Structure 1
């Protein structure tokens, strides 16, 4: 998975992510209403009451709705992404803290926080535990990112020595390794720019580029997390600034198209295909949720505020998994 957040020229904040995985667990956009209540653990029945409503992609087939990403009624946006070989969860809660399943952190944070400071507060009172789940069969190695309505972004990583928190980040996150490693890794590639190198001479040979794009020499094109991070990071820097929210979604999807994995190009050791199942964006100010699927290139939008936020039911919207082609003339 890959993600970033941009800030538009009309002071809107947006967050976007791609979901790469080897299977498609039953998913849909979930609107969770105020006061529905999210569990902390699958084996413990304590349920926290959520103050805020929120919208995002998630699963509704374990006790509480698990969200993969989403936006608040207060503008907090967040996502949980893979963090293989680095995520380490405790076996029993730390003293004075309550246990929490890694899969419920986005739901809980989105339901009760407004700010990145608040997120820092809340996770400080919990202990990510090694509790499994029936949708996967185990507690997945995760790391999380949040961006409030102001634009500030944080990265929370469950490291071996504990919860590591990164503040005022560049607003880019993919998978392992840790955030500090990738941020340092940026320094190796500051030569990657949009501008062409100067033509040089070898003897009497005048050497010139083949076309355009030669300033990018050095950028890796593979789909590892390190290469995905650099491409999102450098294309975030140099892509034109969005002037409004719809441009923001457009530009964000254009940036994530460089890290979009077609089916068949990346296989795991188990021989399974890891591909970009869906791509989504969200705007803090408007609280609109946008998504496109591997099979459908047309963007769909759901508005949080338009629903009844005191509903007693989860409001869900189904994936339209057909290429939504516009026929200009009665096409076969």
Structure 2
């Protein structure tokens, strides 16, 4: 994990959808995963302590350690959520606070999705855990994360494990990328309210008449780079000005169009080490249907996994593998 952009939206259909890109430096073995009720998810990768999960859920994630790790997903009661990179800000403890258990940052999404309904449930659950510096997701240090959640009702929150403790932001705008903290970007929005769909008025310099080249000059000032702050502003503004989605499909379509302003093609961003950082997949999920939708760097065709289609009291993890090949429809031979 190395960067990502997310947002949620509300349809006129009365549905809530959430979506996110994921950026990274290669493809990992990642599938969409359906975790059945009562499966058991650890808190710490170093202790064999299991929490029985009341709920089933589906999302993108890894099976590379003991309990499924979910980057995002939706559960059978309509809770949607994700974890996103939060570098230089994320701060964790060595020891739990008296009265809490240790949890690995990498397990937050799975635990919550499996045991919560509303955004208030999330806030409540969280006060019974301390995020811990557990080394060895055999992928190293606990990655610097922060979290967003959105429930069936359309409310979004952000949880950020800062130096000064856990920060909750309630009733947010339903946008989140990477560092810095949420209130920093919310404040940043203010510097860019002049970014609109509407063209500016022609002007004169002496005798000279000045008019735009074409269209789209309203957005002058919007940065087009892929830093977390730039991405934050493109998702928010294009969330603001994109037409309301009138049903679930349109919602998926509109989410992927907005995220398209923050999709990273392979080669245009390199890391301090010269690894390439690119959008591996984009996904979306609907609280009311509990459908998971996703598309990949190598596959523009959207796939869909339906949570309630499966037997939720299954003993076993149900799994779908990525199809990393451009799914082109041939209209003739």
**TM-score after normalising by structure 2:** 0.98
Instruction: Give 1:103-114 correspondences, 5 Å limit.
Output: 103-114=106-117
Deviation at 1:134, TM superposition (A): 3.9
In 2, the alpha carbon distance for the partners of 1:26 and 1:199 equals 53
**Whole-angstrom CA distance in 2 between matches of 1:132 and 1:142:** 14
TM-aligned CA deviation for residue 135 of structure 1: 4.3
Output the CA distance in 2 between the equivalents of 1:239 and 1:325.
28
- 2:241 corresponds to: 238
Structure 1 runs of 4+ aligned residues shifted over 2 Å read 132-135
Q: Is the 8 A contact 1:38 1:107 kept in 2?
A: yes
How big is the shift at 1:21? 1.0
Partner of 1:305: helix, strand, or coil? helix
Q: Which deviates more, 221-230 or 131-140?
A: 131-140
Which structure 2 segments of 5+ residues have no match? Answer: none
Check conservation: 1:280, 1:290, Cα contact below 8 A: yes
The aligned counterpart of 2:213 is 210
- What's the CA shift string for 1:10-52, capped at 9, x where partnerless? 1000000000011222100000000001001011111000000
In 2, Cα distance between the equivalents of 1:33 and 1:115?
Answer: 19
Matched, 1:162 2:201: no
Q: Equivalents in 1 of 2:27, 2:330: separation in Å? A: 29
1:264 deviation in Å? 0.2
Q: TM-score, normalised by structure 1?
A: 0.98
Query: 2:283–2:293: 8 Å Cα contact kept in structure 1?
Result: yes
How far off its partner does 1:284 sit? 0.2
The 3-state SS of whatever aligns with 1:108 is helix
Is the contact made by 2:45 and 2:137 (CA closer than 8 Å) also made in structure 1? no
Quote the Cα distance in structure 2 between the aligned partners of 1:98 and 1:24: 33
1:169-213: CA deviations, max 9, x gaps? 000000000000000000000000000000000000010000000
The worse-fitting range, judged by mean Cα deviation, of 24-33 and 175-184 is 24-33
Residues matched between the structures, number? 329
Alpha-carbon shift at residue 138 of structure 1 (Å): 1.6
1:80–1:143 Cα contact (<8 Å) kept: yes
CA contact (8 A) 1:101 1:130 kept: yes
Deviations for 1:133-185, whole angstroms, at most 9, x for unmatched residues? 34422210000000000000000000001100000000000000000000000
Root mean square deviation, CA, Å: 0.6
Asked if the contact 2:203/2:209 (under 8 Å) is kept, the reply is yes
Contact 1:25 1:135 in 2 (8 A): no
Gaps of 5+ in 1: none
